[PDB]
Amino acid sequence: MIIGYARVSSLDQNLERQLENLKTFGAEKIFTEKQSGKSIENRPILQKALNFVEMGDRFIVESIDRLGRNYNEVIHIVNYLKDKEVQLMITSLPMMNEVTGNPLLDKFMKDLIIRILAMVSEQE
Amino acid sequence: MIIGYARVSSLDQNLERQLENLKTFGAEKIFTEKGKSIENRPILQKALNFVEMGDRFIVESIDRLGRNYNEVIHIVNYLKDKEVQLMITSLPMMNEVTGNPLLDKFMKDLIIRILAMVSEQE
Amino acid sequence: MIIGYARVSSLDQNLERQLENLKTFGAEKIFTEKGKSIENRPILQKALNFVEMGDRFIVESIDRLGRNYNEVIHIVNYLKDKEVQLMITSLPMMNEVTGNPLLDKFMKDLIIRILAMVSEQE
Amino acid sequence: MIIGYARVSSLDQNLERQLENLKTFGAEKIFTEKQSGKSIENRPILQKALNFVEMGDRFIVESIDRLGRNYNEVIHIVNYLKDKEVQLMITSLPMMNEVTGNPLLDKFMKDLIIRILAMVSEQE
Numbered sequence: 130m131i132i133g134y135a136r137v138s139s140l141d142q143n144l145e146r147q148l149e150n151l152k153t154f155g156a157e158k159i160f161t162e163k164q165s166g167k168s169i170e171n172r173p174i175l176q177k178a179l180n181f182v183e184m185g186d187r188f189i190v191e192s193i194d195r196l197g198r199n200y201n202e203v204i205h206i207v208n209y210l211k212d213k214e215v216q217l218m219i220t221s222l223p224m225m226n227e228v229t230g231n232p233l234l235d236k237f238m239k240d241l242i243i244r245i246l247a248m249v250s251e252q253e
Numbered sequence: 254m255i256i257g258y259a260r261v262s263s264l265d266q267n268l269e270r271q272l273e274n275l276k277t278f279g280a281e282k283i284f285t286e287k288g289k290s291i292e293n294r295p296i297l298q299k300a301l302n303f304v305e306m307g308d309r310f311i312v313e314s315i316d317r318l319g320r321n322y323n324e325v326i327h328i329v330n331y332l333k334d335k336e337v338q339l340m341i342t343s344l345p346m347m348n349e350v351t352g353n354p355l356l357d358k359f360m361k362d363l364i365i366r367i368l369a370m371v372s373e374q375e
Numbered sequence: 376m377i378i379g380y381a382r383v384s385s386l387d388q389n390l391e392r393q394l395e396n397l398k399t400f401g402a403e404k405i406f407t408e409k410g411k412s413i414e415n416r417p418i419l420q421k422a423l424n425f426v427e428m429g430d431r432f433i434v435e436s437i438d439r440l441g442r443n444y445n446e447v448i449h450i451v452n453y454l455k456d457k458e459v460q461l462m463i464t465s466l467p468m469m470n471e472v473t474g475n476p477l478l479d480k481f482m483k484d485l486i487i488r489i490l491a492m493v494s495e496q497e
Numbered sequence: 498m499i500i501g502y503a504r505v506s507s508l509d510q511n512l513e514r515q516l517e518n519l520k521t522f523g524a525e526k527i528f529t530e531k532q533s534g535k536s537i538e539n540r541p542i543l544q545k546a547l548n549f550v551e552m553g554d555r556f557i558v559e560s561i562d563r564l565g566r567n568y569n570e571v572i573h574i575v576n577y578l579k580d581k582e583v584q585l586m587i588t589s590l591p592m593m594n595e596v597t598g599n600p601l602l603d604k605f606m607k608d609l610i611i612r613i614l615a616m617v618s619e620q621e
Contacts, residue, residue: 355490358492359488362484362488363488374477
């Protein structure tokens with residue numbers, strides 16, 4: 130199935146938009162959490178979302194920065210979903226998971242994209 | 254329209270495939286030439302003067318277009334200024350990898366520049 | 376010689392640090408200005424006309440130089456054509472990351488272009 | 498200590514140069530192997546080198562392509578040495594492991610560099 134994860138530091142942030150995007154992109158359930166993306170230890174809801182998703186499911190977020198603002202922890206999460214065979218989609222990067230007969234590059238794209246964004250998120 | 258470009262420095266290369274891959278994606282014309290520089294490649298210059306706004310310049314791979322990081326970037330810049338959409342047959346969909354127009358441009362620049370440094374050091 | 380550049384669009388920013396970080400690395404002069412475009416930034420233009428071959432144009436970060444992917448790349452191109460070594464105080468050693476002159480150039484282009492797309496979308 | 502690994506498909510390749518570079522860069526022992534970099538399963542010498550190196554040691558190669566021509570297997574090896582706390586150096590990229598007060602980027606550099614090169618090696 131399709132699980133989404135939404136995070137905002139404050140309520141003044143457009144949380145409705147985020148939830149609508151996740152829904153629009155097929156979110157069945159959305160684990161919503163009001164917390165900073167600096168660390169995962171203080172984000173039990175994320176731990177629930179990651180534990181709930183299972184082989185075959187889809188885990189969606191609007192952006193990497195929503196998943197976290199910690200390069201190390203973010204990359205750790207991206208590999209967790211791979212190993213668990215859960216597909217990570219980013220609604221702002223809808224075609225990132227699309228196939229183009231070059232498994233090498235495609236995989237290499239994600240690795241680059243995700244690592245760039247995971248860093249950016251942390252530096253900000 | 255759609256325009257292609259092919260190159261083979263020597264006498265022993267599968268030039269037929271190169272011409273057939275361009276035709277596959279819809280190459281209407283092909284400026285075939287027989288990549289260390291552009292000064293000694295007029296067939297390329299002709300292919301660049303032909304293409305105008307709205308057209309699509311295509312190669313099989315960036316190494317065909319040239320084996321010089323400096324020159325290969327200068328030409329991709331040329332095609333852009335001229336509003337000619339560059340496409341690689343071996344790397345289709347390079348335009349929109351994610352959907353975000355911001356990263357699409359960035360990656361396009363990135364992959365091209367990877368391919369260019371490879372084309373040179375080889 | 377060594378030349379710096381600083382910018383602050385508004386009235387509430389730690390402009391002192393920005394001027395002190397440039398001085399730290401050896402900024403002899405600083406063209407301070409008060410980044411959505413360059414047409415409305417002459418102090419930058421003056422900093423670019425001053426720098427000549429052999430000089431070193433420095434900023435604190437690429438976002439200072441401008442918040443436009445298109446324009447930020449055009450200026451780094453300008454500095455290169457003019458043989459002016461661009462350096463970022465917050466990212467020193469960006470020049471030689473590995474030692475291989477081939478990757479150094481590639482990465483330089485890469486990090487800059489990452490920083491540029493960030494400076495814009497922010 | 499400093500262990501090096503040298504590989505060549507054929508003897509017509511300048512193996513002496515490779516060995517001299519490894520030595521010059523401090524190679525104490527050099528596991529030399531005459532084999533393709535397409536796979537590791539058919540490279541028992543590499544398996545010996547990787548098993549021999551231990552926490553604190555250094556594992557050096559002239560280039561990534563020497564380590565392999567398989568993006569997946571290469572990345573698998575780079576993480577193996579990390580987890581084992583063995584420092585991977587590339588004599589053609591001597592300053593790649595150098596420190597520059599930006600642990601974020603530095604790590605992000607390697608991830609990019611290594612992933613670029615690992616791909617290039619495979620595609621060639």
